[PDB]
């Protein structure tokens, strides 16, 4: 793909590699696009909690901030190939920009309804100062999605033992990627298997939402799909790509809860985003 938005004024279009940029801890999908006309750029990070008689809390702040044009030789950086190819599809009045992906800011997250979440945007604008007013005509804004792809780190095999009758319950796979299924060897009337998402908002009001993803009621072994076609989301609900919002490293986490009629057992496991084939 190519990710393009033009301005309401028309006088500048911005192009982006893709829309979802993943932090890998040791390196990250930085932002290497091209601008076409001074001209400035930044990344807004939005924190919203509630909508406009409870509690509205909106907080925006600019994290990277940049003169794009003319390219100051300090911010000058290696041109990506996509940048290299785009700069040939268009004129010499096309300028390549780059932003370091902003790690040590929180992953995109969007709790549906207290509505709540974190958002990201690339914004490039004309001005005669970096802290001058950012109007709507000379601005462009493209929503991006910033996510954390943290794989390395084992301590594998979820399992919880307990004994009033003894109950050892192991789980297939220690981390699971969005889309994957869950198996649960309950090697001990009823059995209740529950995947709960915890989301702890700390956006002013400090709230803890516990939320039931999937469940069955019926040595034995049972299966569950910790997916969304079956809540903290990695995205806005209008995007059919939006999935469940993946264990933080808003704080999201997951846990299995086995109740047998009463013996009781709650077992953690990490949830990573949906495995890709476009790493670096
Ligand atoms: Cl989104």
TrEMBL record:
<dbReference type="InterPro" id="IPR014753">
    <property type="entry name" value="Arrestin_N"/>
</dbReference>
<dbReference type="GO" id="GO:0001664">
    <property type="term" value="F:G protein-coupled receptor binding"/>
</dbReference>
<feature type="disulfide bond">
    <location>
        <begin position="187"/>
        <end position="219"/>
    </location>
</feature>
<dbReference type="Pfam" id="PF02752">
    <property type="entry name" value="Arrestin_C"/>
</dbReference>
<dbReference type="InterPro" id="IPR014756">
    <property type="entry name" value="Ig_E-set"/>
</dbReference>
<dbReference type="GO" id="GO:0005737">
    <property type="term" value="C:cytoplasm"/>
</dbReference>
<dbReference type="Pfam" id="PF00339">
    <property type="entry name" value="Arrestin_N"/>
</dbReference>
<dbReference type="GO" id="GO:0007165">
    <property type="term" value="P:signal transduction"/>
</dbReference>
<dbReference type="InterPro" id="IPR014752">
    <property type="entry name" value="Arrestin-like_C"/>
</dbReference>
<dbReference type="InterPro" id="IPR000698">
    <property type="entry name" value="Arrestin"/>
</dbReference>
<feature type="domain" description="Arrestin C-terminal-like">
    <location>
        <begin position="165"/>
        <end position="276"/>
    </location>
</feature>
<comment type="similarity">
    <text>Belongs to the arrestin family.</text>
</comment>
<dbReference type="InterPro" id="IPR011022">
    <property type="entry name" value="Arrestin_C-like"/>
</dbReference>
<dbReference type="GO" id="GO:0002031">
    <property type="term" value="P:G protein-coupled receptor internalization"/>
</dbReference>
<protein>
    <submittedName>
        <fullName>Visual arrestin</fullName>
    </submittedName>
</protein>
<dbReference type="InterPro" id="IPR011021">
    <property type="entry name" value="Arrestin-like_N"/>
</dbReference>
